[PDB]
Amino acid sequence: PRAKTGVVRRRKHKKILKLAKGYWGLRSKSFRKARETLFAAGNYAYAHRKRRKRDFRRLWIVRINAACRQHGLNYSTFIHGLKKAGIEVDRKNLADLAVREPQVFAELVERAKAA
Amino acid sequence: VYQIPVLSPSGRRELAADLPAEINPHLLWEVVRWQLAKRRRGTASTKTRGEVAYSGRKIWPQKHTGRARHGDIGAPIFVGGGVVFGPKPRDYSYTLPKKVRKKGLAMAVADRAREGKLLLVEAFAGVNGKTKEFLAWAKEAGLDGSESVLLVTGNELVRRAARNLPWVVTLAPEGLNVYDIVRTERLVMDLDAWEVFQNRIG
C-alpha cells in the first residue's frame, strides 16, 4: 500500500503557526520563520526564568539598601547586624516590609544596629 | 483436552479424546500468520527511473544556465519521475514446519474443546441440503445462531445447506485449518471428519 503525506504535514505546520501568533512579519505567517523564531523564544524564556530570580533579588536589595540609609546605615552592614541577631526572617522578598510597614522596619534596624 | 459430547439420534453420549492439555498462543498465532501470508496476492507494482516512459536526454547543460543540474526527467527527483524502492511483484509465502502446522491444528481444537464448545454429531437429517432444513436440525442441536459455527463434514448436501447462514462457515475435513477454527465461536464435526482429523494429527 501507499501512504502519502496527505493530512499530516499541514497539521504539524499548523501547530507551530499558532504558537507564533503575535510575532512580526513572516515570523507569524511563515512556517519557517515561525519555527526559527520559536527556537529562540524557547531558549530565551528558559534563560530568563533563571534570571527572573536574579532580577527580583536585586530590586529587593535596592529598596532595602534604600530604607536603611534613611535610618543611617548601609545594606552591607544591615545584613550583618541581622545575620548576627539571628533574624534571617527578612528574606529580601520582605522588603515589602520596608515599604508597607516602616515602624516594623525601624525596629529591625535596631536589633540590627546592635550586632 | 478430553470429554467430548457426541450426538447419535439414540444417545446424548460423550466421547474421550487425545488432544494436548495445554496450549501455546504464540504457536497458534504463528500458523495463522502463515496462513494469511501465503494467500497474499503479491500484486503491487511501480516504475523505477529505468522503466518510466521518458527519454535518456539531459534536460539542460549542467554548467552556466544557473538552474540546478539534471539528468533525464524520469529521475525520481522529478514530479512524474521514477519511483524509489516502491513495490514490485513478490510472493509472501514461506514454509512452516509441517510439525508446527499439525500441533497448531491439534491445539486449536483443544482450546475449543476445553471451552466445551466442540460438538460431535452423527448423520444430521438436516441433510438433503436446504438451509431451511439444516436450520431445523441445528436448533435441535442447540445452535440458535447465537455464536459463529464452523461446520466440518464431507457431506456435500449438508454443506450447501449450511453455507448461506451468516453465522455458519463450512468445510470439508481436509480443509481443517487453525485460522478458520479460531475465528469461529464453536466447532461442529461428524464422525467421519473427526476420524480423519485424528488420522491427520499424528
Binding site: 524557547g42 531558549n43 539571628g86 526572617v89 528574606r91 525596629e107 | -
Partner: protein
C-alpha cells in the same frame, strides 16, 4: 495583624482570611494546618531569633492543584539538537484562618 510564615522553602505575608497558594504539602484536603512557626507579629516588637515560638498560623488545607503548563524548550544551533518537555507544577492551596 499579620505573620511572616515559612513553607516549601519560601516566606509569605499572611492575613487571617486570605487564600494563598503554596508549595504542595502532604495532607488531606479540608484538614487544618499549623504553620511553623512563622517570623513576625503585625503588632510589632515580636520579631527575634530564627522563629518566635508559641505563635503559629492556622490555615486550612483547601486542595491540591497543578499549575498552568510551562513548555520548557532547549535548542542548540548547528548541532541538530532540540528538546521539548512540558512541565506543570504541583501545589496546594490554603486559607489563612486565625493567627496565634
Amino acid at each position: 495583624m499579620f505573620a511572616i510564615v515559612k513553607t516549601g522553602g519560601k516566606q509569605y505575608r499572611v492575613e487571617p482570611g486570605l487564600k494563598l497558594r503554596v508549595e504542595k504539602l502532604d495532607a488531606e484536603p479540608g484538614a487544618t494546618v499549623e504553620l511553623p512557626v512563622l517570623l513576625l507579629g503585625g503588632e510589632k516588637t515580636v520579631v527575634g531569633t530564627p522563629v518566635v515560638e508559641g505563635a503559629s498560623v492556622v490555615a486550612e488545607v483547601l486542595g491540591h492543584g497543578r499549575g498552568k503548563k510551562i513548555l520548557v524548550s532547549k535548542f542548540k544551533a548547528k548541532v541538530q539538537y532540540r528538546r521539548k518537555k512540558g512541565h506543570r507544577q504541583p501545589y496546594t492551596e490554603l486559607l489563612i484562618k486565625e493567627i496565634r
